[PDB]
C-alpha cells in the first residue's frame, strides 16, 4: 500500500463522455501532494494533467474545456474526457504522490487502456 485502483481498460462512446476511474483509500498520515495523468506515446508517458499546490493545469490546448479530474471525494482522482475523439485511444496513466509519516514521498501509478467505439 498505497495502491491505485484503475480498470485494465475503459471503452467510451465516440464524441461522448468517458470516465477513467482512479481511486485509492486514504492512508492515515499520508498527504496527497501531486496528481498527474499521462498519455502513453510509444515508450514515453506524456503528462496531460497536473494538480499541484496551485490547482489544476491542462498541458495541451486540445484538452482545455474537455478534460476534468474529480476532486470532491478524497482518494478519487478519476479523469473525465468529454467529446471523445478516435485518436484519444491510448494507454493512460494515473499517478499520485504523497508525503508520508516518516517524511518521505511515495509515488504510485497505474495504467488503463482507453478504447473508443464507433
Amino acid at each position, epitope marked *: 500500500r498505497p*495502491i491505485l485502483e484503475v480498470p485494465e481498460s475503459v471503452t467510451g462512446p465516440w464524441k461522448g463522455d468517458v470516465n477513467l476511474p482512479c481511486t485509492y483509500d486514504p492512508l492515515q498520515g499520508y498527504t496527497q501532494v501531486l496528481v498527474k495523468w499521462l498519455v502513453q506515446r*510509444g*515508450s514515453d508517458p506524456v503528462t496531460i494533467f497536473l494538480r499541484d499546490s496551485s490547482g489544476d493545469h491542462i498541458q495541451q490546448a486540445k484538452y482545455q474545456g474537455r478534460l476534468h479530474v474529480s476532486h470532491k471525494v478524497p482518494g478519487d482522482v478519476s479523469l473525465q474526457l468529454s467529446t471523445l475523439e478516435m485518436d484519444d485511444r491510448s494507454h493512460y496513466t494515473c*499517478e499520485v504522490t504523497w508525503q508520508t509519516p516518516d517524511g518521505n514521498q511515495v509515488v504510485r501509478d497505474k495504467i*488503463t487502456e482507453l478504447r473508443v467505439q464507433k
Partner: nanobody
Amino acid sequence: VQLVESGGGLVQAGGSLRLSCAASGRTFSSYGMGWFRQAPGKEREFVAAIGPFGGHTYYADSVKGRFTISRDNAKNTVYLQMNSLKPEDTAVYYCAAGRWNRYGFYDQDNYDYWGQGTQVT
C-alpha cells in the same frame, strides 16, 4: 492468465542460474513485470522489475549487479540472469505482472498476477 517460471534448481555458491517466466493470457507488453523471492520463514522480498512500454529496470540492493531482468515481448516472457549465487538467495522466486508504469514496482501489492515460483538453492 498464467505466469510459469522455470530455470531454478540446485547450485552452489558463485554459480550462475537463469530464470524465465512465460506469460499467457494478455499482451503483457503493457504490464510492468517483476521478480520477487521468499526464503522459508523470511517474508517475500523484491528482487527486480521491468516496466511496460520498453522502459526501465529496477533492482534490490541485495541482488544488484549480480542479477539482471530482461523481457522478450514477442515470446511474452521475462527473464532473470542470476550470477554469483550467494546461499541466502536460496528461496522460491516468483514472477509477477502489474499495471504500474514507472513507480511502485517494489510494492508486492501493485501486482495482479503471480507465478507458482521456481525453487533456487
